[PDB]
Design a protein around this nucleic acid. Structure first.
Length: 265
DNA sequence: CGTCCAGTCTAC
DNA sequence: TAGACCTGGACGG
């Protein structure tokens, strides 16, 4: 997922878990190479926040819960195929790698981290990844300043389409968002990043916020196949007929219209 | 059947 | 930088 999907997943966890109470341990599938979550409580609540391409779960025991346990935080990266589902406890999806089980009273549910390809990761810390820049959705002013104050960095020597995937400066931007952002300003994707940005100190850094915010305001992204059609209708550039495509230097497809730009392969 | 396609992470 | 990490759906023979 990209920023909008991480944000919608966190909203899903908060709304779906608002009136739920979890109990017992945190179950990992046997094939996941991610760490076991050392947590048990008779009664805990689950809440979430997103920052960029990361999601933080907080496991919060209720007053009196046993064993003695302090709130525990988990940070998830989704990779290519990560998501959260709330499912009936005996109808786990195929790739449910981490599960939180509702306590009784009511229907036994499992909140699941589901990840087909297992490119997703989680850490016990609760800390955001060091080196990831601020969230383009929730920390816009910090994100904007962190870019404009470090244009000398060699990251900005690269084509703008490659720079937009660098999570130290554009935390939350992925493949579809870089195409949609550049399409709206008709910036050639192989323009030098430093050239497009030096001329800024509604612009490119503004769209790094407002474009992904549009995806959030659609809602959906899992969180029927109606909001999947809603998304495909919103896309103007990524994968669309009449658009060009090239491989960047890491073999990721950039969709665009017209001029490929000077640093084109 | 087969090939090809859809975000980090790390060994060179 | 190139390869690794993985599964499944769309498509071709």
């Amino acid at each position: 997922g990209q920023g909008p999907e991480l944000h919608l997943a966190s909203q899903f966890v908060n709304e779906a878990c608002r009136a739920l109470v979890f109990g017992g341990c945190v179950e990992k599938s046997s094939v996941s190479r991610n760490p076991e979550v050392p947590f048990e409580s008779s009664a805990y609540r689950i809440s979430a926040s997103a920052r960029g391409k990361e999601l933080r779960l907080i496991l919060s025991p209720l007053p009196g819960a046993q064993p003695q346990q302090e709130p525990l935080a988990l940070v998830f990266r989704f990779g290519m195929s990560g998501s959260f589902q709330l499912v009936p406890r005996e109808e786990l999806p195929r790739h449910a790698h981490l599960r939180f089980y509702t306590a009784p009273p009511g229907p036994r549910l499992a909140l699941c981290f589901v990840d087909i390809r297992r490119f997703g990761r989680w850490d016990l810390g609760g800390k955001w990844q060091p080196g990831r820049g601020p969230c383009v959705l929730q920390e816009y002013q910090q994100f904007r300043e962190n870019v404009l104050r470090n244009l000398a960095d060699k990251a900005f020597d690269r084509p703008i389409c490659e720079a937009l995937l660098d999570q130290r400066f554009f935390n939350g931007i992925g493949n579809y968002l870089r195409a949609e952002i550049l399409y709206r300003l008709k910036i050639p994707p192989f323009e030098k990043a430093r050239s497009v940005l030096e001329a800024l100190q509604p612009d490119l850094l503004e769209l790094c916020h407002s474009v992904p915010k549009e995806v959030v305001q659609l809602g959906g992204r899992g969180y029927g196949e109606e909001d999947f059609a809603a998304f495909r209708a919103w896309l103007r550039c990524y994968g669309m007929p009449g658009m060009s495509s090239l491989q960047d230097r890491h073999g990721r497809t950039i969709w665009f219209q017209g001029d490929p730009g000077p640093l084109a392969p």
